[PDB]
Design a protein around this ligand. Sequence first.
Ligand SMILES: Nc1nonc1C(=O)NCc1ccc(Cl)cc1
Ligand SMILES: Nc1nonc1C(=O)NCc1ccc(Cl)cc1
Lengths: 238, 238
Amino acid sequence: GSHMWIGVISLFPEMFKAITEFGVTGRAVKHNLLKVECWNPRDFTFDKHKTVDDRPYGGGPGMLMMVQPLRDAIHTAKAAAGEGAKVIYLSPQGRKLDQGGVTELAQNQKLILVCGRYEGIDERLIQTEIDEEWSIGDYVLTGGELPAMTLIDAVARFIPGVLGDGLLDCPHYTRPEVLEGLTVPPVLMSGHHEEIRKWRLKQSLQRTWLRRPELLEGLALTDEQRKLLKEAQAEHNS
Amino acid sequence: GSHMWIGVISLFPEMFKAITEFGVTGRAVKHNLLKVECWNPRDFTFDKHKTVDDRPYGGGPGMLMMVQPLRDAIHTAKAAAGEGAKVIYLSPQGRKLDQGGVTELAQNQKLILVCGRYEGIDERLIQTEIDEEWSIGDYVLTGGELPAMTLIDAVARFIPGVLGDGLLDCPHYTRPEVLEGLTVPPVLMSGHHEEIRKWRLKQSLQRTWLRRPELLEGLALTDEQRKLLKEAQAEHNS
Ligand SMILES: Nc1nonc1C(=O)NCc1ccc(Cl)cc1
Ligand SMILES: Nc1nonc1C(=O)NCc1ccc(Cl)cc1
């Protein structure tokens, strides 16, 4: 129904087997809920050695992706996608991805993801070919493929059929009842669904406050959430 | 010399071919600068169907990783690593990764990365087996493998031999001189190394100010950087 098509431009398309052949995303691909289609700039070269990098104007230690093979690969992906495809470039200079941004990106039925390698791509290609630039985090990687796969994995979770409040998750427990002397909180064994719900919510509120208090600032807590957070803060202060 | 060993606990170890077989990280592995060794909890099961998940106490829609196979895999990885290995769990509840955190993690000669699947792992395993919990970003993925590979890629860049100031990168240009009517900034063609350096720095300062002004707050700018940022802000205000 709400299946998603993702075109990828990458010098290493075989990396994408990590998401198309395994786990939840692998299942999504097999079931046609997600399609990932790759184009490799190396296939758009014409010289004997299939050159895909080029020297930066102004000098410097690094190389950039060569414009012509990359541009031709992007154009081919765009032609395959048809109308309505948003072209995304992954880099540390982009908009910071968070779950809200994931949900925004997931509204697209078609995306094209451009994966950089080496020390950059020509700025004029960003101006002329790229719709949006996004970053998965404030760290530097060797290429855009892992960020692209990260984005695909995150948006895939919103496609209906793929899976079976601003707070961190609560602790979870499974067998055995006692592990290294540590027991399961009795509330989780009580079978009281309402008590269990409130315990889990209180724990999420407490953990968010202690570990990521800035996340709480962005929330308008419900009356119930205000109460449970206040209880948690009181207990923390003994 | 400063080679790094990374042990990985994962239900899908073949995903890690994405970093061990391709690009800069692939080269690092071939050259013995980086070693990535995987253990699969499925191999530590004893039942006929090799069960690796289990039901959460207190109920709920999800499953957790089964404790015994996961615990045994972690212990085996620890035994292989010997003394000094830091055990890392990847999840959205962890410390937010940034380049500074990458450089901190890169000081370790040995890491063990635990990759979760399903809806969590038992909290008591985090308490008893995990040294540090880290997040690659405020979004939710289907498993910890992509975050683990992201971390590996980022820290690998600091291993000497693997590769050939708090600001966003500047624009880069390569051939052709004119692309879709857009020309290369004449300064980059001038061959004046000092003018080129200052242009690039000014551009990084301008881009950081416009796109990520909060990053500037964390910096103590040099006199030169203060001057170039002021120039950029003046030109932006016409
Ligand atoms: N952080 C991030 N969020 O998205 N992408 C990144 C990142 O570091 N990419 C590496 C990269 C990106 C472009 C080129 Cl040309 C080379 C390497
Ligand atoms: N964000 C992040 N930063 O590190 N990891 C993540 C993440 O979403 N992992 C998915 C995940 C983690 C543990 C388990 Cl049990 C299941 C799924």
